[PDB]
Ligand SMILES: Cc1cn([C@H]2C[C@H](OP(=O)(O)O)[C@@H](COP(=O)(O)O)O2)c(=O)[nH]c1=O
């Protein structure tokens with residue numbers, strides 16, 4: 225897997241954001257996670273956490289996995305990094321997302337995220353509180 229450049233266009237919610245990738249605007253959906261919708265418990269906190277993480281970053285990167293790069297809704301599917309720190313993992317570690325949507329061929333960082341989730345749970349963070 226390799227990281228590619230991208231620029232924030234706009235935060236949307238916990239696990240989605242608009243980025244410009246290869247000079248084109250695209251909604252990205254975070255691989256391997258599920259944040260609550262804004263209208264749900266921990267939804268706003270999830271949205272706020274990622275927004276801050278990406279808006280504060282000097283460098284956003286996208287990392288496609290080995291399988292599908294686009295979902296059925298035309299969203300990019302990737303691991304997103306903000307100054308070297310993976311947003312997908314950070315959300316899980318804070319108990320602001322669950323490991324979810326783990327399809328074969330796009331699950332390279334599954335164990336890593338599961339590791340993060342187990343630690344969030346032990347700490348009973350946010351969603352596990
Ligand atoms: C994360 C992810 C979601 N999706 C699809 C599954 C769900 O379709 P359905 O809505 O039909 O169940 C939807 C959930 O996205 P949200 O969690 O953003 O709603 O996105 C993929 O197809 N691939 C993925 O890697």
Ligand SMILES: [Ca+2]
Pocket residue numbers: 239258259260261
């Ligand atoms: Ca969601």
